[PDB]
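WARN  no MSA supplied for this record, continuing single-sequence
INFO  ligand: FON
INFO  echoing inputs
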Amino acid sequence: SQLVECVPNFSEGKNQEVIDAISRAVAQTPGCVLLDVDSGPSTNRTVYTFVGRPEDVVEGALNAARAAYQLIDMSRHHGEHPRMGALDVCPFIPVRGVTMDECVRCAQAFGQRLAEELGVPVYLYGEAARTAGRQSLPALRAGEYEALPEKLKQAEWAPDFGPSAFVPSWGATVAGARKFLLAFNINLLSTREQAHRIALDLREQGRGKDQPGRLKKVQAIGWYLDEKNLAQVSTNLLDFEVTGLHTVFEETCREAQELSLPVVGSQLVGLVPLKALLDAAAFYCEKENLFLLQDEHRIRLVVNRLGLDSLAPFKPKERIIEYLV
Amino acid sequence: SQLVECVPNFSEGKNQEVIDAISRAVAQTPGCVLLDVDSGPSTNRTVYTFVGRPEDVVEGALNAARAAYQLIDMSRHHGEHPRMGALDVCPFIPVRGVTMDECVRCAQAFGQRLAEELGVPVYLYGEAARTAGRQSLPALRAGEYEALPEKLKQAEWAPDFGPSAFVPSWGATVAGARKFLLAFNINLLSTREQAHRIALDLREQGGRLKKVQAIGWYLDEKNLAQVSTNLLDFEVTGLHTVFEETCREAQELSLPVVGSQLVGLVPLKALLDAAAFYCEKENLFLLQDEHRIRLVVNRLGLDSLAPFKPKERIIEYLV
Ligand SMILES: Nc1nc(=O)c2c([nH]1)NC[C@@H](CNc1ccc(C(=O)N[C@@H](CCC(=O)O)C(=O)O)cc1)N2C=O
Ligand SMILES: Nc1nc(=O)c2c([nH]1)NC[C@@H](CNc1ccc(C(=O)N[C@@H](CCC(=O)O)C(=O)O)cc1)N2C=O
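INFO  complex generated
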């Protein structure tokens, strides 16, 4: 039984009617099981996480996109999270009995069909990228929605699928394939400027080719959320096996400490693979010379050390993918 | 108007119908406003926190006791928290426009009416104690429900109010007056014995912490142990100190602390004092009270077992 995870992000995190309509589009698609919907009002973005056979998740992603096309007007969208499209990024991840190559095929099929139906520009990223410059989502997203009109007039920005036209209500969509990614935000009582400084010091790309960051396979930016009245170092762990949750958290804490800024827990966006939490547990057990044999205790430990309950209760059975599937 | 806080503990933490019946008894009493109900299945105990005018809270506590008398059978009760009565302890605390002396009078009034109306033995503790030996609840509760039959036969244990008879379904009740007390539990991934050993080294009665009582137990529903403490005077020994000391003792045994839990309500200053501790330790500067509270909730891990909502847990935010 082949299983692929699809984690599309949409530029709407305030209007519950719109959020729910997109949820129904996914959940009502044959073969698709919606596992999570995580929306934020200040970030003004929602990530949907669902699974199913390769061909089924492609159909689910398209049904979601079609609903979004009617309900989201990018010309009026603003939020803390970077974005350039109503359906900003649509990734396909291999979960079981599926190769990364097939997921790339799913991304290509999805992208082609999305572009054809809506007449919008679509870019391929990650393992589906046609060129090294399009591998990175932040690179493709540079300048955001506001920069599209100018970018679309340049040959180098010719989309992988669709016309090089600026469609006000939609913008541009990025589609691709990749391994599991962890969207992890670290809370700090600081200014957005201080949080961003830390983000730039830690993210692999740093401040530029001549100014690399400290952590490999980590993307990050800093912001402030009116909703929670606090700043966050928002990160993406592209390969937790290379750089895990504990490492990103501990390094952020260190940098914050150097500036006399306090870290106050964290927030996982969407779902997380069990191993990412167990890897972190192993780290703290070694650092603290602990001895635990139960996974529930390992998880309880990590949840407390990273402060994953800070903004809302962290329920393992609802957040760990292996516990949901 | 005058305001007194009453925080009675009842020996029932599993049967929701019984817990709710007692909540209704309090909430339906004129002048009483129920602010919190905290029930635990392992401790098999529920703490009710309510406020109202002096006489009103006495009536509320009595209505709660009458409901409990018909719904709780102590001959079948067992739990992690020490206990000797269906309504185990009933404290009265001054909140607004009331002196400790008046609260002592409320404790005495409640104690006598309870004893004579239900026909049960009642002891006075805290500021209402009739003798120095009864100021301490742990001393009066020594031996628990199981020791009552024998204790009641001794002149030394004659109740302050009521008959000296052993009432199987009820046991005995302790009533008194005191300043705000903080019920604070620290979570440990350890055995019950290890948690209790730490409790013994930390409690003043031994210990290292002045004005702190402590015992160790296990929460089967959460699969973790807790060093359960009572901060009798947070101005002397605060939340930060109790937490940090427990952490230190646990580290000595390679046992990890995983947050904590406050039972009931807490005065704003107790949280702000703790915030100041971490700000000193970490060289921080935080202008906002919201941030100072957020800092302590994270440092102490107060959201470990359930969300800690300041507006629903801080006295000054509820008054
Ligand atoms: N109450 C609340 N407030 C928030 O601000 C908030 C939450 N909830 N929920 C989750 C999230 C809002 N939603 C999202 C959705 C996705 C990403 C995200 O990082 N997506 C990556 C995906 C990369 C990929 O798939 O390759 C991105 O870079 O686009 C950020 C925020 N969030 C707080 O963030
Ligand atoms: N699900 C859950 N599980 C729990 O075990 C838990 C909660 N919730 N809530 C309630 C509480 C269990 N009950 C209690 C009851 C009282 C004290 C307590 O320290 N009371 C003092 C009062 C002193 C006085 O008023 O003078 C006492 O010594 O009687 C501790 C835990 N608790 C927590 O793990």
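Chain B touches chain A at residues 189, 223-224, 251, 254-256, 258-259, 278, 282-286, 288, 290-291, 294-295, 298, 301, 303-304, 306-307 (CB under 8 Å).
INFO  checksum written, moving to next record
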